[PDB]
Symmetry: D3
Subunit: 148 residues, 6 copies
């Protein structure tokens, strides 16, 4: 099945939002196949954010995410990359709908709590970045009531 | 006042979602005028799904809903048929917004937890299908703070 | 497995507490094997309350419970009769602990929201009172993660 | 920082929705810089609703809001006027999305629970209407994890 | 009916716990007859804490409570003074049960979030301290489903 | 500050209870200083359960915990070892109070969802068992509103 990578960033961890966030994806029915808390390395942060490398805000992205603990997760399930994004909301928390994570909890583009993969393609890249293969679940059993 | 019919299907019952679902419509202010759990008969299931009778997925619809317990409800209140639908989300749970029932809990079109009437017209039909007149509340008292 | 009978009384129904209550027993892992809303008959109410027949408050018990809709439920699971009672709290809602149903929601002995069976013995009696055998689930499947 | 004025009207207070509403804006990260419960004066109600003065429904607006207690609040934070509106929903609760306040709790345009300022301009006016300067917090400290 | 005084102290306000706390007493069925946020005066703080005047920790109590905003409330209902205390927990949050306010949210005796009146006698005193008679609701209407 | 070790066992993970559990300790104010999901090794399981080595149920304990994924956590804060235990409940979920984790969610001694350290002494041992020193947070910053 599809897998995505989500990190709740230092601001989400510091605000005590980790469990609330995991519980939202668990209720949806996605399965947790990798999880750890870590303080990202500058090397890791720069690779993760490589797409924004030419833009002046790249260095801020890199400073913040290495500024404290991150909890890195990967979830598995049908259509999880796009669904996970729908559940986060949009870039600007102020513009994100009530009921989404950033819509419910966030106020600033610079402190928007959580990030998730763009695409199936960048998810594959990001998972291999943040996780070793031995840190990820091999045999996954979803609730039998979830999939036809 | 308007009435609609909602069934939480075998997958919603099995996942322990019944109370969560009723509590959403109670908080909104709709009044429960009929409620029961039952394992639908094939005769009942086929009439309920008669609209999809010509399509090949008709038989799957009929197999699943008779496969386990269903909790059948009817709610009363202004604009309840459309409102109830807004609160469920859309056919594809993956595409349903955060904050809706299928948006919050579901992943597969084939396991989308709950169904509700299309229209005032099919609600009237579906209620008479699933419920006897003596199983429905006659005198309804909504919260006095709900309606001008 | 053990079964118990719980009714959320007219005051709980009228206050929109039905879903909240069912969701508590679903989360605990007990399985719903019977459910319906009805306005109790005086004959039914008097049999249900037969134990208090000699006491002067018997008639009040009987008046209130027939005064509006009741949602009658039976749940199945290990030790459900005593557990269900632990989750309700004690007779006086004011004295019931935070976290219990009556502790969280109720204020008056006369409006204490829900009743549940005393014992396995009176549960058996009360279930046969309120429910026909064909209204109760025969084959029960609990979450496989609940029981060793 | 921006400030807005929100009142939960008599119907929201009477339905026990005050805490739920405040908790939504607290979780978002907006800071409470003024709060009180009062039964609005006719003079206050007419000024507050001055914009609808020419329309026939003006007098109903004025009757209802002075009909019971109101809890008047002002919140501070980036983009709070528009954000607060996004979180309330739209005029018609039936049409308001799941996850919004009116979408979750309300049914009637005439009983839509809460009102919030239109604009930064009318917020400034409404705050000075309902609150004395000494009733508002001067030094505000938001969670340090909220703003970049 | 009985009335009690509760203040959520600067630590509860700063942690965004105000709405959660009010919502607990609203769900229980107690009625809010007074509410405001204020930064307590030293004169007010010393009178409020007069009982601990001889003990060395008196001055700390007085320093903290005047250190930031407090939201002062009074609730009405049967047995509210003792019930409100049951719902808060005990002095030491570490020892307070799960399901109580201090049991759920607090860790330190010095930061225990909320205080409520000791007795009907000190409630009467504390209400007259913190509130003017014109700031309190005169005609109270509780949910009709609460009291027999 | 004190640290404790908690594991949500395979039954808690499989039931989608991970986020709910973390969110309870985050709300209390304890700080997450280590977190990962893993499928325990038999060597690890036997050391963890060494205290029950002579009893016949030792092998069952060891079979179950290595039977699926576990999410291993360590939390930091004043009095966290005893507090964490208070929040879990007692051995028998049926006997655990409403409001505790096992009281809210569990039914069987053999499937009681989560375990936490006995004492400060066994916490120290268990943390060194399950975690490498580099997997644990060194500089911890609790909410400034938590500790006097």
């Amino acid at each position: 099945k599809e897998r995505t990578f989500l990190a709740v960033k230092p601001d989400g961890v510091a605000r005590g939002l980790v469990g609330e966030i995991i519980a939202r994806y668990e209720k949806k029915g996605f399965v947790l196949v990798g999880l750890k808390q870590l303080v990202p390395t500058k090397d890791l942060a720069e690779s993760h954010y490589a797409e924004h490398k030419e833009r002046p805000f790249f260095g801020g992205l890199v400073s913040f995410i290495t500024s404290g603990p991150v909890v890195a997760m990967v979830f598995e399930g049908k259509g999880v990359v796009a669904s996970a994004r729908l559940m986060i909301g949009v870039t600007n928390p102020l513009a994100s709908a009530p009921g989404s994570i950033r819509g419910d909890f966030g106020v600033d583009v610079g402190r928007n709590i959580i990030c998730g993969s763009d695409s199936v393609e960048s998810a594959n890249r990001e998972i291999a970045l943040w996780f070793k293969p031995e840190e990820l679940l091999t045999e996954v059993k979803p609730n039998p009531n979830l999939y036809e």
